[PDB]
RNA sequence: AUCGAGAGGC
């Protein structure tokens, strides 16, 4: 029920596409020049500028009918700025010992490549995305 | 009432008569005519 | 002609109940039941003759036999019991 | 025509070829001409194909022409329907049209005939030839107000 | 119908509170579907809304005569001079909720015509009404409490479905069923039959 | 053909139609008048006598009532005029002619009856007003329209007849038609335009609207789906909320042009177990299309679930639409000054090409290409030039159409509209034609008395460079009308010719039935086909799938 | 000819209870109230007020047919919270805000001249 | 605003509809069909005024 | 055939404004836009009731019976 | 003043009232205007008994025109719905009877206004049933026109009702209703050709709220709680009473729900 | 006075008609882009001029506003339907005893008028009303 | 039995191309139980997909052809309704006799 | 009853 991935990416290219409140962001890992990702981001809620540095995280938890946060009684599992929920729909074997995971947050897509997360990411409905400032 | 008083019949019976003809300019309304059967045979001045 | 019957072992017609013979069967039963005729199932609070016949079918309590006619005049009798529904 | 053909590798590739289109038809003579492929020549005058290549080639020419007329408007209809039509036109000796001259002079009972065209003349011909209607046709049973041998009445039901 | 072949019937009657409303409080007498516009290319209707809007505001007439030098640009210039959006759009709020409509709406006066085809003049329903004399079939027409024709075009459809019993029912019990007596030697209804 | 092959019938009804978004597919809105007028014979039984007594007491003047009682003797008892209409003692084995009530099966028809799908059984829903009401997605088989159309209704009178209506002729059974081996009903003009806007990646819904959308789905599980966005504000996506209408256990897989599994343009469709992953929903996905959602649900889940899915998706999308709004207006016919400048530049360059080819012909410098005269070559070149010009201006306009343009929106969703419509309304309506050629010389060597003789100009023979937006000139108006009259005639004639043709086909193949031995025979039993469709399948439940052996290199085949 | 008398929009008839209450299925602590002879004037206000009580989990309404003046309001509340009480609190708070509005408006109007 | 131009027969107002016909006493030439034994024709409808 | 009581759309009583309007055009020689503006008919839903009205009753009165 | 919704009146007149609502959620303002239109009760003619009619109009034409006439409805709360009163058909506590009788005496055209309506029934001392007359000349609405020799003699019975039953029973004059002129909420998507700013005109209400900064990000958690309204009345009820009675009618409508809840 | 002539179909074969009197003006650039594209006449041997081209239409089509903006079959359909619209067919309707008569309560003259209407007496005997029309998707009824 | 082998000949080709031994295990990853379930589903859907005797397929075909022709609408060959009437009514004197030579 | 005409949808 704990974290399944953690890394820091620096933004390379933001592209609004034909959209008005969503941009397709393309970034790569920092201090690790082999693993990159692509994501769809609501810029209206949490803006995203070029060459920013965003702390990315994936969790398996923290089925049941969602209920609004009643009060501060609910202890958040996040001091981040941006959180989404998605579902894994493809695990692409890029090459020998190089894998890619495909996520969709109700339409907003995510593509992540590299092979230092093999033991954690899974073909599981549960997937929480988290971005920090 | 006005339209009925300027109406022509053509009892010959076949699309060559039914078509709007060049000579109809200024003499017959181009668009006003019944639809379906007997279209283009019945015209208005 | 004379007794154009068919042995039950040598039958090649489709063992499945065609939608047409099913609708005819259900109609005839719902008709029988529209009139005060006996029902051969525990109607669990069902009143519509059609629902009664439809549930009489799943429990195969409908004692009727189809007579599938062949073009030469021959025919095959098929009890509702052995017929399949899918 | 930019026709497709198997490459020696096996993959299909487009191999354009020059084709001749006439403005007239005498199939018998043109078929026996050198320089052509007497196995690929084609005519839209399918009745000539019935005369030359037999009725069975006329079946395929008929289906191809109807396919063209339907798919011209971007429409599509499943094979079986057009096929049924073509076979009914063909299942006789040669070509039977969908008109009073064709199928309606068959032996298809008598009441079925009088329900399309030439009603009273067909009735009279039946009065003369002492015709006997089988009463198995659709329109025969409809005219008589009986349950016709249709999907629901294509059989009998009895007791177990 | 409008003046551009945009014929149409009423599907619903909405009271004014249930009607979408503009900030001026104005409300449509009529609501038509956009999907009737582009396939017919009846642009004159669109121009008519614009011109009639400008006229009602200005207290002048709409020179909708053909073969004129009236352009949509001049009309829009007048309309903007009168404080409305140039192309005829208007912010409209939902009637039930009161939350704004994301889409701004095309909205304006348009000449409409009430046609001679009204429902209660065309509604018809018959269950075992009067029969004809010669055929002993139902009579023709709603003014005589007649029956709808079950034509052969529909007999064909019933055949395609496979419903033999419904077909016979429509064709015998519902129209002109009858029972006759025939001789088993001469197959003709020349049999004299006393039932009493 | 008028008293035997067809006949006027009792228990018939007929009136105007109009659409109801809040009716299930197989339902039909029956006016209370017709329900009071049409009767069904119900024989009394211990299961119904309690309900039939109440019906008889309620009398024929108000619904649910009844009109006549039939005794075992066989005498009719008229409830309108009878002293004993109050103290009735129904006896077992009697018949009550009750009113048409809710959920009765009725045969529903629209002329012309070209299809088996034109006469479909419906569930009665008695409604107040005077119009017949039906779900929009049942229009396509009937080719109905709510512009004054009329529809007929027929009431079964026997139990097996009700059975045949409900189990063979029902609406959900005819969703997949044998003709064209594909569904004949789909999502239409309002739901179709709306569902796209709903399913845009840019479309985000807040809590309040989301819960109403959830409730609006009738067979709903009562489990709030987790929102797609959580941290800054709990947000849902149109895809997410719509997926509640999609039954679990469904997979739909379709790739458009340039469709990576990342799908940057959000095209294609990937729906995994009752939830959609990526893809903007439009006509290809949810239309009456081969291999669409309706095909999948009808084959996998069944007819009834597909029918309920119709209602659910309609209710959700219509609710969203009603609060989001959509209007067309005139603003969607204006291209900017630059675009119109390029368009008139295109028209002038085509005019110059025509002028040049004309003078070339005037100097007897044509290359007499084989098989055709010089005049034919000339006319074909000018017609080609002018059509290329029309399509170039149209594409010039369509490029400039913004993504908010409502005409472009209806085009994109596939609800209504085409490229040519945009081109004519905004760029150029094009060249008119009569009997194939351009506008002919009705007068002596001229088209109109405002032209010098022997003028083969673009506009002299019917080229309308003005757009419907810009406005046509008198001559252009006259030529346009001249052309459109030919179309009115073509319709008014092909209608009759096709009615005759259809009737002939029907009367020629009427007796062809797949017998029990899979032979396709006739009244005489003469074999037409030995296996129906040459494979013995029903035309329904037949889908387009690829054969992977054909095609591809022998190398890839081996690998 | 077939139109219903318009007073049927607000006049209950023949034992039409104003409110019917049904326990929801496949949902614990959930209940659906059929309001009779009401429209979007009432249901929207009740739902938007229920959406303010933090102990309310599910709050929505629907008008299944504009022909009829009636609607359904479904409420799901926290454990130990009868939804009828959440409805009561919502209604009473609405009435309190409305009275406050009336008093403030009367104040400003009597302050106003002309 | 009544415009006239109608009759009143047995109470019902009647209108005579203009009947169209090609004028007589004018000469016109018509080609003939491809399988026709004759090539061309010149016809005139001789009508006494 | 006579001045409607109130505007169909909004409901503002306009039937009490016919004769006044006709004087505002005749006595004061105003124009239709300003005559409608003077009578407090500011929304066009109201204006189109007075501007597009054809008072046919003046023809019906001429019939003596 | 009092905790909750705040009202600030911008302009007040006998005929309309332009004001501002603060600290109110939307659905309340919406339901308020809905009740202001439909569910507030007044008095207007709901039966017409005609005796002689020689006019160029049909009887139903005139009956319709009459029903639409504004009548004073201040003390309408002291009048009861005739459906609730115990009289045979109508009484003096449930109905007000007007009479109308005019004759074409003059050779000139004779007009028939609303001022010619005569209150016959017993008023029992309440401000009820007097036709509303805002005309500068003093006449009413032009009900009909009479030639010399035509007469019209009828009797109108006016009862209580709400605009749901028929639109004649409304103070229903248009109600202006705007919120968030700058669209800071992002509640509508603006259609444009070149610039949404220059092509869309600014509302008068753009003054009473301060503009947003192009550099400021989208305020996502903000909701709309500040509304601009303008309520206009035909005159059957003064404006202040239109909005107050709408408020009270809505509150009363909620009350019945509590009463049914206790009855359960 | 010999300023106007009666021209039938046969005679007009031998003349050259101008569409507008502006065609007779001498010519010797910067134009409104929104106006329709009018070709230069390219002819000079005129003998006539149309009184006004809109006079090619009938009594029904002369009601259609901006019929030069509509696909022609729509202009035909409206001509066929304007003969089914209700309104005051005659001011003496209260005297005539016709088998059927439908009369609009409150007819209104259109806000957009053809110049031809003045001679068709449409603004005096209208047949419809200036309804406030909104084009919108709203509950899909 | 030969008629049966002939009537299914095309389907079985797709079947084998789809259930190829290397395909079932490298492209698909079917377990044993999943494979037998695939078999059961195919046989069931097939046996359901057979035409039901009593089907009046003649009328169905005639409609299936006539109705799409009613929408048949408007480079040298006769097409549409004229060509269709040339086809059904066997037209000896066709308008556009052509001959395509390869 | 017969017949004529006009109109409605595709
Ligand atoms: Mg229609
Ligand atoms: Zn005998
Ligand atoms: Zn108004
Ligand atoms: Zn009383």
């Amino acid at each position: 029920s704990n974290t399944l991935f953690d890394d820091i990416f620096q933004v390379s290219e933001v592209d609004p596409g034909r959209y008005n409140k969503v941009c397709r962001i393309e970034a790569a890992s920092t201090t690790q020049d082999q693993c990159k990702l692509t994501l769809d981001i609501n810029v209206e809620l949490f803006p995203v500028a070029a060459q920013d540095s965003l702390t990315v995280t994936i969790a398996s938890s923290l089925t049941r009918s969602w209920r609004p946060p009643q009060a501060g009684d609910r202890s958040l599992a996040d001091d981040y700025d941006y959180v989404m929920y998605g579902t894994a729909y493809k695990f692409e074997e890029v090459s020998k010992d190089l894998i890619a995971v495909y996520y969709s947050f109700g339409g907003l897509l995510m593509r992540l490549e590299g092979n230092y997360r093999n033991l954690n990411n899974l073909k599981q409905e549960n997937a929480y995305l988290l971005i920090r400032r | 009432t006005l339209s009925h008083l300027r109406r022509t019949n053509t009892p010959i019976g076949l699309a060559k008569p039914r078509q709007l003809h060049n000579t109809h300019w200024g003499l017959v309304c181009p668009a006003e005519t019944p639809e379906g059967q007997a279209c283009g045979l019945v015209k208005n001045l | 002609l004379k007794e154009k019957a068919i042995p039950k072992d040598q039958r090649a017609t489709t063992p499945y109940m065609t939608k047409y013979e099913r609708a005819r069967i259900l109609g005839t039963r719902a008709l029988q039941i529209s009139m005060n005729a006996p029902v051969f199932v525990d109607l669990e609070g069902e009143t519509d003759p059609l629902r009664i016949a439809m549930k009489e079918l799943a429990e195969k309590k409908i004692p009727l036999v189809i007579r599938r006619y062949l073009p030469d005049g021959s025919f095959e009798d098929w009890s509702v019991e052995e017929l399949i529904v899918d | 025509y930019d026709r497709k053909v198997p490459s020696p590798t096996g993959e299909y590739v487009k191999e354009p070829e020059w084709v001749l289109e006439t403005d007239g038809v005498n199939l018998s003579e043109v078929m026996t001409v050198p320089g052509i492929d007497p196995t690929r020549i084609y005519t839209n005058s399918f009745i000539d194909i019935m005369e030359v290549l037999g009725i069975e080639a006329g079946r395929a020419a008929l289906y191809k022409e109807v396919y063209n007329v339907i798919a011209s408007d971007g429409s599509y209809v499943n094979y079986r329907h057009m096929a049924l039509l073509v076979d009914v036109m063909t299942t006789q000796g040669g070509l039977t049209s969908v008109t009073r001259h064709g199928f309606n002079r068959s032996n298809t009972g008598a009441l079925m005939r009088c329900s399309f065209e030439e009603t009273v003349e067909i009735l009279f011909e039946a009065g003369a030839s002492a015709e006997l209607d089988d009463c198995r046709g659709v329109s025969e049973n409809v005219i008589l107000g009986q349950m016709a041998p249709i999907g629901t009445g294509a059989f009998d039901v009895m007791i177990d | 119908a409008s003046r551009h072949g945009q014929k149409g019937t009423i599907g619903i009657t909405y009271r004014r509170e249930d009607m979408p409303f503009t900030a001026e409080g104005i409300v449509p007498d009529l609501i038509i579907n956009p999907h009737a516009i582009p396939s017919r290319m009846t642009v004159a209707h669109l121009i008519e809304c614009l011109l009639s809007k400008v006229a009602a505001l200005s207290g002048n007439e709409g020179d909708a005569s053909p073969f004129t030098d009236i352009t949509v640009e001049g009309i829009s210039k007048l309309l903007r001079e009168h404080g409305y959006q140039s192309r005829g759009f208007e912010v409209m709020y939902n009637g039930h909720t009161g939350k704004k409509l994301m889409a701004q709406i095309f909205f304006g006066p348009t000449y409409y015509q009430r046609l001679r085809h009204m429902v209660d003049d065309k509604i018809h329903a018959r269950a075992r009404g009067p029969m004809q004399v010669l055929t002993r079939q139902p009579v023709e027409g709603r003014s005589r409490d007649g029956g709808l024709r079950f034509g052969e075009m529909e007999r064909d459809c019933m055949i395609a479905h496979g419903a033999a019993s419904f077909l016979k029912e429509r064709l015998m019990e519902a129209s002109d069923a009858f029972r006759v007596h025939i001789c088993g030697i001469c197959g003709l209804m020349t049999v004299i039959a006393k039932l009493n | 053909r008028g008293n035997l092959m067809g006949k006027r019938v009792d228990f018939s009804a007929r009136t105007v139609i109009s659409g109801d978004p809040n009716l299930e597919l197989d339902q039909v809105g029956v006016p209370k008048s017709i329900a009071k007028t049409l009767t069904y014979p119900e024989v009394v039984t211990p299961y119904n006598i309690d309900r039939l007594t109440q019906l008889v007491r309620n009398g024929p003047n108000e619904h649910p009532g009844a009109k006549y009682v039939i005794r075992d003797s066989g005498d009719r008892i008229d409830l309108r005029y009878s002293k004993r209409a109050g103290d009735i003692q129904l006896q077992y084995g009697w018949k009550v002619e009750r009113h048409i009530m809710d959920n009765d099966p009725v045969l529903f028809n629209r002329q012309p009856s070209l299809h088996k799908m034109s006469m479909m059984a419906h569930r009665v829903k008695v409604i107040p007003y005077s119009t017949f009401r039906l779900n929009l997605s049942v229009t396509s088989p009937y080719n109905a329209d709510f512009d004054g159309d009329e529809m007929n209704l027929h009431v079964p009178q026997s139990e097996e007849t009700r059975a045949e209506l409900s189990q063979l002729c029902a609406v959900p059974l005819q969703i997949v038609s044998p003709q064209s081996n594909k569904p004949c009903m789909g999502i239409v003009q309002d739901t179709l335009c709306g569902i796209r806007k709903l399913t845009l990646r840019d479309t985000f819904i807040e809590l309040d609207q989301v819960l109403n959308m959830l409730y609006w789905v009738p067979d709903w599980d009562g489990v709030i789906p987790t929102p797609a966005i959580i941290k800054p504000k709990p947000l849902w996506s149109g895809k997410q909320i719509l997926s509640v209408a999609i039954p679990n256990g469904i997979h739909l897989q379709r790739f458009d042009e340039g469709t990576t599994l990342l799908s940057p343009k959000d095209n294609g469709m990937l729906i995994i177990d009752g939830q959609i992953i990526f893809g903007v929903v439009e006509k290809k996905t949810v239309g009456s299309s081969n291999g669409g959602l309706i095909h999948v649900v009808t084959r996998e889940k069944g007819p009834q679930v597909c029918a309920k899915l119709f209602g659910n998706i309609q209710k959700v999308v219509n609710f969203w639409l009603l609060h989001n709004g959509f209007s067309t207006g005139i603003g969607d016919t204006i291209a900017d000054g630059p675009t119109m400048r390029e368009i008139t530049e295109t028209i002038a360059e085509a005019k110059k090409k025509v002028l040049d080819v004309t003078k070339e012909a005037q100097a007897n410098l044509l290359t007499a290409k084989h098989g055709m005269t010089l005049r034919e070559s000339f006319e074909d070149n000018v017609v080609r030039f002018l059509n290329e010009a029309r399509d170039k201006a149209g594409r010039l306009a369509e490029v400039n159409l913004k993504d908010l343009n409502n005409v472009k929106q209806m085009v994109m969703a596939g609800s209504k509209g085409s490229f040519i419509n945009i081109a004519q309304m905004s760029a150029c309506v094009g060249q008119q034609s009569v009997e194939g050629k351009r506008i002919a010389f009705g007068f002596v060597d001229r088209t109109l008395p405002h032209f010098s003789k022997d003028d083969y100009s673009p506009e002299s023979k019917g080229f309308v460079e003005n757009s419907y937006l810009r406005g046509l000139t008198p001559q252009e108006f006259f030529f346009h009308a001249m052309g459109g009259r030919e179309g009115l005639i073509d319709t008014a004639v092909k209608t009759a010719e096709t009615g005759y043709i259809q009737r002939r086909l029907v009367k020629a193949l009427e007796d062809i039935m797949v017998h029990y031995d899979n032979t396709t025979r006739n009244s005489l039993g003469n074999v037409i086909q030995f296996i129906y469709g040459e494979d013995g399948m029903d035309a329904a439940h037949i889908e387009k799938q690829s054969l992977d052996t054909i095609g591809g290199s022998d190398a890839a085949f081996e690998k | 000819m077939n139109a219903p008398d318009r007073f049927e929009l607000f006049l209950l008839g023949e034992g039409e209870s104003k409110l019917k209450i049904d326990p929801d299925t496949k949902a614990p602590n959930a209940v659906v109230i059929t309001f009779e002879k009401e429209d979007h004037t009432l249901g929207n206000l009740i739902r938007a007020e229920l959406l303010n009580d933090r102990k309310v989990l599910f709050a929505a309404y629907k008008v299944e047919h504009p022909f009829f003046a009636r609607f359904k309001l479904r409420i799901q509340t926290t454990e130990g919270y009868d939804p009828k009480d959440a409805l009561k609190n919502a209604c009473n708070s609405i009435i309190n805000k409305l009275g406050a509005l009336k008093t403030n408006f009367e104040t400003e109007w009597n302050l106003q001249t002309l | 605003f009544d415009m006239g131009g109608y009759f009143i027969i047995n109470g019902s107002e009647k209108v005579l509809i203009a009947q169209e016909r090609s004028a007589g006493n004018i000469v016109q030439v018509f080609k003939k069909a491809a399988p026709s034994p004759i090539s061309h024709v010149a016809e005139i409808r001789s009508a006494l005024e | 055939m006579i001045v409607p009581v109130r505007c169909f759309s909004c409901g503002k009583v306009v039937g009490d404004k016919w004769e006044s309007y006709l004087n505002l055009l005749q006595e004061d020689e105003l124009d239709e836009g300003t005559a409608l503006s003077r009578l407090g008919l500011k929304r066009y839903c109201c204006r189109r009731m007075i501007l597009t009205h054809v008072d046919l009753i003046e023809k019906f009165l001429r019939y003596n019976p | 003043s009092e905790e909750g919704p705040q009202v600030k009146i911008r302009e007040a007149s006998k005929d309309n009232v332009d004001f501002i609502l603060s600290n109110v959620d939307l659905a309340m303002a919406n339901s308020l205007r809905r009740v202001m239109i439909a569910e507030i009760p007044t008095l207007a003619i709901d039966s017409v008994e005609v005796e002689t009619n020689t006019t160029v109009l049909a009887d139903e034409f005139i009956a319709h025109r009459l029903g639409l006439i504004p009548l004073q409805s201040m003390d309408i709360e002291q009048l009861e719905y005739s459906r609730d009163c115990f009289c045979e058909d109508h009484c003096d506590k449930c109905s007000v009877v007007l009479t109308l009788q005019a004759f074409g005496e003059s050779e000139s055209t004779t007009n028939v206004y609303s001022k010619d309506l005569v209150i016959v029934s017993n008023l029992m001392g309440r401000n009820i049933g007097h036709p509303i007359i805002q005309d500068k000349e003093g006449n009413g609405v032009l009900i009909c026109k009479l030639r010399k020799g035509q007469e019209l003699k009828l009797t109108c019975v006016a009862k209580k009702g709400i605009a749901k039953e028929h639109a004649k029973w409304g103070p229903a004059a248009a109600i202006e209703f705007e919120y968030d002129p700058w669209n800071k909420l992002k509640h509508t998507d603006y259609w444009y050709e070149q610039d949404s700013a220059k092509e869309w005109p600014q509302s008068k209400n753009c003054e009473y709220e301060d503009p947003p900064n192009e550099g400021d990000p989208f305020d996502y958690k903000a909701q709309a709680d500040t509304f601009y309204m303008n309520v206009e009345s035909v005159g059957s009820i003064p404006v202040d009473q239109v909005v107050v009675r709408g408020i009270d009618t809505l509150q009363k409508k909620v009350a019945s729900i509590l009463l049914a809840l206790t009855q359960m | 006075e010999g300023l106007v002539e009666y021209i039938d179909a046969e005679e007009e074969e031998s003349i050259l008609i101008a569409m507008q009197p502006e065609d007779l003006e001498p010519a010797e650039l910067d134009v409104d882009p929104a106006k329709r594209i009018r070709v230069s006449h390219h002819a000079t041997t005129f003998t006539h001029c149309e009184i006004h081209p809109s006079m090619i239409l009938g009594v029904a089509a002369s009601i259609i506003p901006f019929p030069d903006h509509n696909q022609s079959p729509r202009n035909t359909y409206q001509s066929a339907m304007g003969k089914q619209a209700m309104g005051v067919f005659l001011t003496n309707y209260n005297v005539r005893m016709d088998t059927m008569a439908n009369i609009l309560y409150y007819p209104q003259k259109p806000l957009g008028t053809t110049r031809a209407m003045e001679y068709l007496k449409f603004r005096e005997l209208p047949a419809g009303q200036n309804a406030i029309v909104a084009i919108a998707c709203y509950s899909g009824y | 039995q030969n008629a049966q082998r002939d009537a299914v000949t095309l389907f079985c080709c797709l079947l084998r191309s789809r259930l190829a031994t290397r395909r079932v295990l490298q492209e698909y990853r079917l377990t044993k139980q999943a494979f037998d379930w695939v078999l059961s589903n195919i046989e069931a859907q097939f046996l359901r997909s057979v035409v039901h005797p009593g089907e009046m397929v003649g009328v169905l075909a005639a409609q299936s052809i006539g109705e799409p022709a009613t929408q048949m609408t408007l480079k040298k060959v006769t097409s549409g309704v004229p060509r269709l009437k040339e086809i059904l009514n066997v037209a000896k004197n066709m308008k556009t006799p052509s001959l395509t030579v390869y």
Side-chain angles (χ1 to χ4, degrees), chain D residues 54-90:
Chain D
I55 171 78
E56 274 282 340
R59 217 210 66 111
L62 205 37
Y63 172 88
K64 198 175 186 295
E65 283 303 299
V66 184
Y67 186 110
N68 286 259
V69 311
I70 295 185
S72 39
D73 288 67
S75 299
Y76 157 61
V77 180
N78 201 249
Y79 179 107
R80 26 196 56 79
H81 310 307
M82 317 177 189
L84 212 173
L85 170 59
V86 173
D87 298 12
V88 179
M89 299 173 59
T90 286

Side-chain angles (χ1 to χ4, degrees), chain E residues 7, chain F residues 110 145-149:
Chain E
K7 41 183 175 58
Chain F
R110 148 88 142 85
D145 203 338
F146 313 142
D147 52 62
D149 271 285

Side-chain angles (χ1 to χ4, degrees), chain G residues 20-25 30-34 72:
Chain G
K20 187 217 294 292
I21 296 178
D22 295 319
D24 202 328
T25 317
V31 86
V32 47
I33 325 178
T34 297
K72 290 195 184 188

